[PDB]
Structure 1
């Protein structure tokens, strides 16, 4: 489900796209260059920023990683094996989420 940009009601998948849209955020999250893949260069900073957006006290990587795993069975995202803090958007699921 699509939210207004920069909104507190935003879902995690859209928030990550928002961070990736601005190259200035590369010290915490960056595109890998192929097929919707990205890397959290600073996963604790990504979790901190997610906590700030959702005003969720005690947001941390443990909780963020649980939230990302929820997307595996929803065709929104998968974990990329053999890399550090690497994930891949599923744009087949996100195309529906736009509707």
Structure 2
């Protein structure tokens, strides 16, 4: 059995650069970035899936903001501003706020027809219940 296919490795399952390159959507966007962090085993301490579908929660809001800023060269980035970005998604039907729960948002389920992966397949690949 020479032809070995040991899947991927230890890198974000859905990296932002590739997603954005694939869709030719322009420079990387906030939701694409959060998607990368979420499909990456290591990032799991400051951002994770709540287990309920596409609902995710920013366990440590500032760590996520710090990286968002470091990624776009916006040193003064933080959650108060990062979140304004999310609120604009409410109309564009991309992400919605999970009312009543601190730091909790949910992608619209149509992300599944774009990614090709099911929230459950993604949960499995990583490790969440």
TM-score of the superposed pair, with normalisation by structure 1: 0.84
- Offset at residue 97 of structure 1 (A): 7.0
Query: In structure 2, do the counterparts of structure 1 residues 34 and 54 end up closer, same or farther at CA, with 3 Å as the change threshold?
Result: same
Structure 2 segments unaligned to the other structure (5+ residues):
1-18, 116-129
1:23 Cα deviation after fit: 2.4
1:79 is matched with which residue? 97
Question: Deviation per CA, 1:14-33, whole angstroms, max 9, x where unpaired?
Answer: 10010000121121100011
Give distance in 1, aligned partners of 2:69 and 2:96: 21
- Post-superposition offset of 1:38: 0.4
Structure 1: gaps spanning 5 or more residues? none
TM-score (norm 2): 0.65
Structure 1 residue aligned with 2:73 = 55
CA RMSD of superposed structures (Å): 2.0
- Pairs aligned (count): 93
CA–CA separation in structure 2 for the residues paired with 1:91 and 1:14: 15
> 1:29 is matched with which residue?
47
- Of residues 7, 10, 14 in structure 1, which corresponds to 2:32? 14
> Which has the higher relative contact order, 1 or 2, with Cα contacts under 8 A spaced 6 or more apart?
1
1:4 equivalent in structure 2: 21
**Matched residue, 2:120:** none
Structure 1 residues 10, 97: CA separation in 2 closer, same or farther (over 3 Å shift)? farther
Which residue does the alignment assign to 1:38? 56
